[PDB]
């Protein structure tokens, strides 16, 4: 006996719904009808969701369709305008199967379990430029985003991509649709390195964007673009940059080859299906069906595995997300302000057509691409000084004790003197200063220097990150962080260190004018009388916490901590404070400018200062490369020469 | 004028035809400056198309501004779909009971949606605060692609991370129930997990095939556990079986108020936001309700509404939202599958805090296992091998058994009553034994000799003594924290290079340490010279060392700081003293030794300076450690 098994579908036209049923008896008649026979049932768009979701649960579940297929009405309204039937269909998990939807929001599962489809959506075109990067060997790019579920899909899946490679992140940037102007962005985009772009967004969006780009003559040559179908389409195009390189699906506006196939699979798959038992017809009617219907996902489980390599649209795979896989797209090129085939990509592979290739401005082939670093800093004494500029004039013109003129450059930070605390311009010169200069002359780099909000160098706190400049070198506030920090495992994980500049060592501090080890006896017996101060999250004190040997002694340090460095070299000068325990490096000089206080001991916890910088980055590799060289022909030692007055002081006994 | 609004209300199910219609509403709290309008209506059973269809149905000219949605179901579906028509109308619509309150994926923006539900994040919470008040420590997480995964997984992240306890997540798990299995892939992946503690998360039929397939895999029985959020207990009325006994799981409470109470908070939440927005804008928030034509005019005004709507007062009862559209904190209640179908109460929970009831064993030693067997060595200051009275046959007092393969021998002292308060404080058993080779332990060109031995051998799990710390042991084996303040020193009668070398001084000068020591591995290490000469004036034992300081023959001696310090205190005349302070150099300390980065390790750590922490460190130095010499003081 025969059975009717219907499927259903809502299309634009009457006439593609006569394609729709004409594919469908194409089917029936090209396999067993015997056994089994296909039915064909379909609704024209319908003008809200509401109109249509009654459709589907009254017109087409009635008719106990086992599928549904979908495709973009003629005037798409807002987008994904098939939103509904996924939903309505999943209720009871019937498979839907879209032509004309390349929105990204349906490639999760999670919202949408019942939702395949015969086209890719716009995030895999990102295969294409991971393919397309991998050709021309730029691994550094930026990606503009808009902020949606969109955007941020293409972002993760060129991520992704890229995760397989070390991540490359060379810089991400999100903006907000509808958002007229973007130019503060781009202006932020300039200062990165690499100069090749991509970008995803909408029309009118990608009008802003080219429009915005244009002013700032980022449309220029050693640019280079990479985008999206949508892009390159509507008035997006009217202000598109010359030489842009740009994506164009196949067969993407045809809803009907995509029917034909669609249905060709359809009828594969449940032709495969029925060749299993224990199968149930699905609900009839949406009236008194709360349950839903067990063989649906079973029924996308085959249909996602279909094979049938032979379609009208080219080879039909399905990805995990019942996304298409191995779908064909064709590259486009503006030349002379049209759009041109320079190629075109079918498989995992690209394939170039003889037309020649396009760069915006004038090339007859150029495939250009790939300057600042933003410094951080801490007010510390010896390796830091900190003035404001006169008025709007720069720097003093003061001289080194060697006859030299003093070295000065430009930092935002910190002010406490102001009741509320501004990031202030101010001047700052420094042995570091005149270590980064050196290395600015001996490295292609350029630099800019603001000291960090925070006091404190950094310290893990509050989830979050570790409060302090080193947070902003995570964060990227600033890629490379000047300053005198020690270096420690603890951190070293997270980041790279330089080689270091100086080496150095803890100790203390107390008045001569009248401690036998770094373990002291009388610090081994405190005395509330006898205090020993020290700075609440300063590195030390990760030393005390960490160290499980010592964890007992930490307690004691830890009452009656100071601030920052100037107040705590000025409680044992102003004697509050019997004692004062810091890294050498920041202490000794002190020793020398004063001689009232002196240093005892031998520097324990012995270290080294170093420049911090990501793992990730390879400048590093130049900058420790570049400190040996500087420590190998005597010019640290001459600037600690400098920068450490030695005049006087002597051992006081 | 006179500003009445317009609502509406549904129930489903209530197990009635001829469900209690209208038993609310009556005029409470009629102040408020909106007197509401209701128009009530049930049906049966949910469909899509049914509700759709009836709620636009109540639409038609009506304009309703309002509506609440309750039901009798266990269904998941139906809370989304109630917001789908809002998305659709921008008519704000809540739900009190069952599915409707039961979680959701996030809301768009736009739309208006809210229930009496509480959030994931929220249940999240209570989840870990209930595995915390158990101290179960450890455990992993079976999830499924529904929505609130990954909110669920970051929400579990961030409560996580916060804590100072050393929880530990071992897996975490996610499987499409798309893409139903032949494979029983669930079965092949949740055979994995040998975690204690489980979290699940998924639809309330989900569950049941997750729960058939651990209940084949062996996962619900004996020992581990199950926790579960709002969505799997549902309405809690219908208990398939297939789930296991024990399962412990939280939901909102019938008892306390009964479902037209929260019909009346639903109602009062609307009309309190109605009076709010109207005493901002003096404005009838009422709007044309029909769906089929395009959304009224104005109504794209009613944004602020949802602005207003987040947090709402009444009765002395806060309503408050969360931007998700779940309720900030509603009452909460922990329950557990009593034994048979029973759903019983075991906690409740509400806003920051929680409380519940049962004290212990909710629901071969638990806490911890195995057993231990020691090694020391004598010492004359550390520990005290005595013999034991042959007409006793057994120890005596605090003295503790130890064997010696060669006749059991009596060991008291200071490792002995240390070891004693600590296996008192962390509450294990132990076996004690006398090392027979090499002592403390001793490198002969390649290998290892001593109680490190008998610790590498694993014959031994850790060793205790007067045994030094060095940077070789604390590489092969983790060490205790020092308890005592010691090391190398002097001891004689009465860096200077004079120690370097004897033959700079004219009449050969004389010192010897004890071989086979920490104290001579390390001068050969650091200092040759010295050792190579002192190898003649070494000596057999610390009371025959002393036997070469006392009655002549040797000028200095030099041993472990501890050591030297008791017998500068105790001697036969005070005819012995330390170096200058007997500060000494390599500063160190007893410590124990432990396998290695496995073992109860930090749990020891904090014993023994509870040990300080109490004073006890102090009666027994003066007990054990204090000499009589040093009496001039």
Redesign the interface.
């Given at each position: 006996d025969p059975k009717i098994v219907n499927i259903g579908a809502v299309l634009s036209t009457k006439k593609h719904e006569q394609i729709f049923r004409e594919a469908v008896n194409q089917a029936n008649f090209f396999h067993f009808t015997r056994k089994i026979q296909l039915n064909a049932t379909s609704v024209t768009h319908r003008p809200?969701?509401?109109?249509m979701?009654?459709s589907v649960?009254?017109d087409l579940i009635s008719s106990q369709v086992y599928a549904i297929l979908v495709s973009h009405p003629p005037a798409p309204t807002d987008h994904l305008t098939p939103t509904?039937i996924s939903?309505?269909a999943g209720?009871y998990?019937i498979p839907v199967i879209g032509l004309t939807t390349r929105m990204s929001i349906y490639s999760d599962?999670?919202?949408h379990?019942?939702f395949l489809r015969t086209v890719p959506p716009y995030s895999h075109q990102a295969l294409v430029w991971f393919e397309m990067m991998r050709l021309f060997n730029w691994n550094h790019v930026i990606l503009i985003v808009s902020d949606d579920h969109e955007g941020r899909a293409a972002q993760k899946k060129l991520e992704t991509l890229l995760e397989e490679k070390e991540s490359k992140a060379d810089k991400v940037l999100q903006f907000e649709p509808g958002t007229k102007n973007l130019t503060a962005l781009l202006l932020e985009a300039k200062e990165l390195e690499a100069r090749v772009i991509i970008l995803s967004a909408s029309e009118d969006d990608a009008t802003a964007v080219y429009k915005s780009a244009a002013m700032l003559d980022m449309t220029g040559a050693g640019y280079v673009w990479l985008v999206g179908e949508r892009e390159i389409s509507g008035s997006a195009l009217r202000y598109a940059p010359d030489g842009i390189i740009g994506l164009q699906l196949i067969n993407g506006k045809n809803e009907s080859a995509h029917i034909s196939d669609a249905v060709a699979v359809v009828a594969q798959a449940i032709h495969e299906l029925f060749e299993m038992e224990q199968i149930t017809d699905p609900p009839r009617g949406?009236?008194?069906?709360?349950n839903?219907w067990?063989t649906g996902?079973?029924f996308?489980?085959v249909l996602?595995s279909s094979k049938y390599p032979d379609g009208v649209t080219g080879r039909i795979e399905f990805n995990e997300d019942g996304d298409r896989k191995f779908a064909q797209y064709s590259i486009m090129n503006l030349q002379n302000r049209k759009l041109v085939q320079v190629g075109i990509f079918d498989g995992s592979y690209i394939i170039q057509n003889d037309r020649k290739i396009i760069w915006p401005g004038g090339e007859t082939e150029r495939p250009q691409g790939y300057t600042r670093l933003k410094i951080v800093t801490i007010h510390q004494e010896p390796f830091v000084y900190v003035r404001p500029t006169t008025s709007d004039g720069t720097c003093r013109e003061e001289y080194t004790i060697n006859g030299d003129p003093i070295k000065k450059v430009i930092c935002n930070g910190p002010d406490e003197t102001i009741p509320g605390r501004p990031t202030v311009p101010q001047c700052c010169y420094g042995f570091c200063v005149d270590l980064l200069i050196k290395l600015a002359r001996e490295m292609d780099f350029t630099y800019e220097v603001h000291l960090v909000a925070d006091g404190k160098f950094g310290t893990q706190e509050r989830?979050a990150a570790w409060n302090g400049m080193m947070g902003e070198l995570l964060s990227g506030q600033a890629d490379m962080i000047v300053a005198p920090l020690t270096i420690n495992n603890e951190r070293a994980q997270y980041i790279e260190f330089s080689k270091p500049f100086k080496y150095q060592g803890l100790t203390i501090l107390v008045k001569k004018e009248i401690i036998?080890?770094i373990?002291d006896?009388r610090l081994?017996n405190p005395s509330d009388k006898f205090i020993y101060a020290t700075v609440k999250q300063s590195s030390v004190d990760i030393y005390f916490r960490r160290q499980?040997?010592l964890?007992?002694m930490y307690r004691h340090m830890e009452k009656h901590n100071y601030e920052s460095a100037a107040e705590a070299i000025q409680a044992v000068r102003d004697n509050k404070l019997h004692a004062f325990i810091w890294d050498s490096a920041v202490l000794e000089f002190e020793a020398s400018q004063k001689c009232d206080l002196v240093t005892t001991g031998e520097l324990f916890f012995r270290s080294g200062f170093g420049i911090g910088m990501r793992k990730d980055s390879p400048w590093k590799q130049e900058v420790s490369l570049n400190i040996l060289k500087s420590h190998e022909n005597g010019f640290m030692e001459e600037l600690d020469k400098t920068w450490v007055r030695y005049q006087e002081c002597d051992s006081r006994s | 004028k006179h500003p009445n609004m317009d609502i509406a209300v549904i129930l489903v199910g209530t197990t009635e035809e001829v469900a209690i219609k209208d038993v609310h509403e009556k005029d409470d709290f009629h102040h408020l400056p909106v007197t509401p309008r209701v128009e009530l209506v049930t049906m049966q059973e949910s469909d899509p198309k049914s509700i759709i269809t009836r709620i636009c149905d109540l639409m038609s000219d009506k304009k309703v501004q309002g509506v609440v949605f309750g039901d009798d179901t266990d269904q998941e579906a139906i809370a989304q779909i109630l917001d789908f028509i809002s998305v659709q109308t921008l008519t704000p619509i809540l739900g009190i009971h069952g599915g409707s309150s039961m979680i959701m994926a996030d809301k768009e923006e736009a739309s208006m949606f809210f229930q009496f539900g509480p959030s994931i994040e929220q249940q999240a919470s209570v989840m870990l605060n209930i595995m915390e008040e158990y101290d179960w420590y450890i455990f992993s997480i079976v999830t499924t692609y529904f929505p609130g995964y990954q909110d669920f997984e970051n929400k579990v992240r961030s409560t996580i991370e916060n804590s100072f306890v050393g929880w530990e997540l071992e897996e975490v798990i996610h499987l499409d129930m798309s893409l139903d299995d032949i494979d029983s892939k669930i079965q092949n992946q949740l055979k994995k997990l040998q975690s204690p503690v489980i979290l699940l998360y998924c639809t309330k039929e989900e569950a049941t095939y997750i729960f058939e397939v651990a209940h084949s895999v062996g996962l619900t029985g004996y020992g581990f556990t199950w926790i579960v959020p709002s969505l799997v207990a549902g309405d809690t009325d219908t208990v398939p079986d297939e789930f296991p006994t024990g399962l412990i799981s939280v939901s909102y409470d019938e008892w306390d108020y009964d479902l037209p109470a929260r019909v009346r908070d639903g109602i009062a939440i609307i009309t309190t936001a109605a009076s709010t927005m109207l005493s901002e804008h003096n404005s009838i928030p009422q709007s044309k309700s029909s769906c089929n034509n395009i959304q009224e005019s104005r109504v794209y005004e009613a944004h602020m509404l949802k602005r207003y709507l987040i947090n709402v007062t009444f009765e002395g009862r806060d309503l408050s939202f969360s931007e998700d559209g779940y309720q900030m904190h509603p009452k909460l209640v922990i329950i557990l599958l009593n034994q048979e179908r029973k759903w019983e109460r075991v906690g409740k929970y509400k806003d920051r805090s929680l409380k519940m009831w049962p004290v212990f064993d909710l629901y071969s030693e638990e806490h911890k296992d195995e057993h231990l067997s020691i090694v020391t060595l004598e010492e004359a200051p550390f520990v005290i091998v005595e013999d034991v009275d042959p007409l006793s046959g057994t120890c005596m007092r605090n003295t503790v058994p130890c064997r010696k393969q060669i006749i059991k021998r009596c060991c008291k002292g200071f490792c002995i009553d240390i070891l004693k308060k600590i296996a008192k404080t962390v509450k294990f058993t132990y076996d004690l034994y006398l090392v027979t080779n090499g002592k403390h332990g001793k490198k002969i060109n390649g290998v290892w000799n001593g109680m490190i031995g008998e610790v590498v051998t694993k014959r031994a799990y850790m060793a205790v003594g007067s045994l030094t710390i060095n940077e070789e042991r604390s590489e092969v084996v983790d060490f205790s924290v020092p308890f005592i303040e010691t090391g190398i020193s002097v001891m004689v009668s009465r860096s200077d290079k004079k120690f370097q070398r004897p033959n700079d001084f004219s009449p050969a000068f004389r010192f010897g340490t004890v071989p086979n020591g920490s104290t001579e591995r390390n001068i050969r290490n650091n200092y040759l010279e010295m050792h190579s000469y002192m190898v003649k004036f070494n000596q057999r034992s610390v009371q025959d060392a002393l036997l070469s300081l006392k009655s002549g023959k040797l000028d200095a001696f030099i041993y472990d700081a501890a050591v030297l310090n008791y017998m500068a205190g105790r001697d036969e005349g005070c005819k012995l003293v330390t170096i200058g302070s007997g500060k000494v150099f390599a500063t160190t300390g007893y410590g124990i030794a432990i396998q290695k980065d496995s073992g109860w390790k930090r749990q020891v750590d904090l014993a023994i300076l509870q040990l300080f922490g109490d004073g006890e460190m102090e009666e027994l130095e003066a007990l054990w450690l204090t000499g009589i010499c040093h009496n001039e003081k």
């Open positions: 809200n969701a509401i109109q979701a009654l649960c009254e509904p939903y309505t209720f998990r599962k999670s919202i379990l019942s949406c009236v008194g069906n709360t839903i067990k996902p079973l996308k489980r996602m989830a036998t080890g373990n006896p081994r499980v040997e964890s007992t | -």
